[PDB]
Amino acid sequence: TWEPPCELLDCGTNYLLKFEVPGIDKKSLSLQYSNNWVIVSGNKNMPIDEGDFCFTEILYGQFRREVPVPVDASKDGIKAYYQEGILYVKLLKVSNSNWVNVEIV
Amino acid sequence: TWEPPCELLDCGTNYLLKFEVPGIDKKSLSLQYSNNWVIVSGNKNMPIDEGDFCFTEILYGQFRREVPVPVDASKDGIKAYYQEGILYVKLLKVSNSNWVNVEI
Amino acid sequence: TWEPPCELLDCGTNYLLKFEVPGIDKKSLSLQYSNNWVIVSGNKNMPIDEGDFCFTEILYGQFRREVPVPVDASKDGIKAYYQEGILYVKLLKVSNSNWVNVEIV
Amino acid sequence: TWEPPCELLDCGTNYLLKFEVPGIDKKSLSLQYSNNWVIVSGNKNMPIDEGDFCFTEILYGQFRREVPVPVDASKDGIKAYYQEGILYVKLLKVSNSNWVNVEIV
């Protein structure tokens, strides 16, 4: 139903991957890493409890985002945080990269 | 300047105006109410201190937003909180009843 | 140092990643794989042997392009076939796949 | 109606017009010459039989390009050769001499 904008910073030691997800159900939040891809998915419930809509520009509902990650990013050591409405994913940088070469025919 | 998306809510007692402002400069942030207008403004700075861009689709910069507010919203009692990347502005409805509920 | 246009295709059994590299030194064409990232590179040098430029819209020089490739792309069994100015890369879809669930703290 | 990038080379005794056209339909490819104008046209079909787009930067559809050639160029002896995704159009130059050089075999 919608897609959060993301940002990737190189901070030298690690990468830091960021998703702009203000005001989501922090219990619905889910992120997995796999083969240098990062998958975030979650849900943003309408405020049925808070009151009735007068107007709204806010996107509600289900969201998902698959985002590639540089080669020197490692599966082991990943951390994530949800602060001030941003999901931060801190990935470490493995040094070695198995730089296989493909033959063309 | 960019604009943050906003939404209004009626909740009987009070209107609840909301702005999505994730990762903004809390010291910059600035909220003023005048004449059925709520004006919100601040800065969301690029994170030069965190690292170096590889790509970004985040909007950075200075934001202003004027929102007009219903007429039964009161100038008094106005409160604003910032939490989880959302600025809530809670405006009180101007009361039409002389009777006062007693909370007991 | 330009980059050639490219294209991803899903063929069920396999993925097909294409690059348009027309009129390049077929000897310079390199193609490396690492961690779901493909890196194609090469050199396309001027036609000084054919003649002298009256005008040209054609990009000459060195080129590389890094393209990330989907999660179910397989590290093993990549075939690269060059035909008629287009460099094809057939990637195998994988069967089992390890994931990591990250905790959002 | 996209248009392919092109190039004009002065090779002394002839001009070389070059249209970069990787993987067009070789059939339905139409060259014309009249009054110092070269008109190339044709079509490039989607790979409906190869897969399904995951993404693409390749322009598809029907193309056309109209190129003025030099005052120097002849309306005779024009030859066109398609190879490795490049269409070569080879124009002669209007002869400036009456002596004819005799290649001794």
Those residues whose C-beta lies under 8 Å from the C-beta of residue D47, and which sit 6 or more positions away, are C9
* Cα D29 to chain centroid, rounded: 10
* Sheet with B30-34, side-by-side order of all strands: B30-34, B37-44, B61-68
With contact defined as beta carbons under 8 Å apart, do A38 and A19 qualify?
no
Q: Where are any strands of DSSP class E within B1-104?
A: 6-10, 14-20, 30-34, 37-44, 52-56, 61-68, 79-83, 86-92
* Sheet with C37-44, side-by-side order of all strands: A100-101, C30-34, C37-44, C61-68
User: Could you tell me the CA-to-CA distances from B87 to A26, B20, B40 in Å, in that order?
Assistant: 17, 7, 9
Gap between the Cα atoms of A79 and C100, Å rounded: 11
Residue A61 phi, psi (nearest 5): 115, -155
Please choose, from the candidates A1, A3, A7, the residue with its C-alpha nearest in 3D space to the C-alpha of residue A87: A7
* Sheet with B52-56, side-by-side order of all strands: A79-83, A86-92, A14-20, A6-10, B52-56
With contact defined as beta carbons under 8 Å apart, do B73 and B15 qualify?
yes
Identify the residue whose tokens are 């240098």.
Answer: A36
For chain B, the first-to-last Cα distance in angstroms comes to 49
If you count DSSP H runs as helices and E runs as strands, how many of each does chain B have, helices first? 0, 8
Gap between the Cα atoms of C94 and C88, Å rounded: 19
Among the partner-chain residues A78, A80, A97, the one whose CB lies closest to the CB of C35 is: A97
* Closest alpha carbon within chain B to A14: B51
Are B54 and A85 in contact (CB < 8 Å)? no
Gap between the Cα atoms of C71 and C36, Å rounded: 7
Gap between the Cα atoms of B33 and A81, Å rounded: 34
User: Please, where are the H alpha helices in B32-103?
Assistant: none
Residues in chain A closer than 8 A to C81 (CB atoms): 104-105
User: Please, where are the H alpha helices in chain B?
Assistant: none
Gap between the Cα atoms of A9 and B48, Å rounded: 10
Please choose, from the candidates C2, C73, D51, the residue with its C-alpha nearest in 3D space to the C-alpha of residue A102: C73
With contact defined as beta carbons under 8 Å apart, do B78 and B33 qualify?
yes
Q: Where are any strands of DSSP class E within D1-105?
A: 6-10, 14-20, 29-34, 37-44, 52-56, 61-68, 79-83, 86-92
Gap between the Cα atoms of C66 and C69, Å rounded: 10
With contact defined as beta carbons under 8 Å apart, do C31 and A104 qualify?
yes
The structure's method of determination equals X-ray
At what resolution in Å was this solved? 3.3
Please choose, from the candidates A95, A87, A93, A70, the residue with its C-alpha nearest in 3D space to the C-alpha of residue A22: A87
Among the partner-chain residues C53, C70, C85, the one whose CB lies closest to the CB of D9 is: C53
Residue C8 phi, psi (nearest 5): -110, 145
- Break chain C into its structural domains and give their ranges: 6-92
Given this structure, which CATH class describes domain D6-92? mainly beta
Are D8 and C54 in contact (CB < 8 Å)? yes
How many Cβ atoms sit within 10 Å of the Cβ of residue A80?
Answer: 20
Q: Where are any strands of DSSP class E within C1-105?
A: 6-10, 14-20, 30-34, 37-44, 52-56, 61-68, 79-83, 86-92, 100-102
How many Cβ atoms sit within 10 Å of the Cβ of residue B29?
Answer: 18
The upper half-sphere exposure of residue A30, i.e. CA atoms within 13 Å in the direction of its Cβ, equals 10
With contact defined as beta carbons under 8 Å apart, do C14 and C89 qualify?
no
Buried b (16+ CB within 10 A) or exposed e, A47-60: beeebeeeeeebeb
Those residues whose C-beta lies under 8 Å from the C-beta of residue C2, and which sit 6 or more positions away, are C59, C61, C63
User: Could you tell me the CA-to-CA distances from D84 to A19, B48, B52, B97 in Å, in that order?
Assistant: 44, 47, 41, 85
Give the bridge partners for A52, in sequence order.
B10
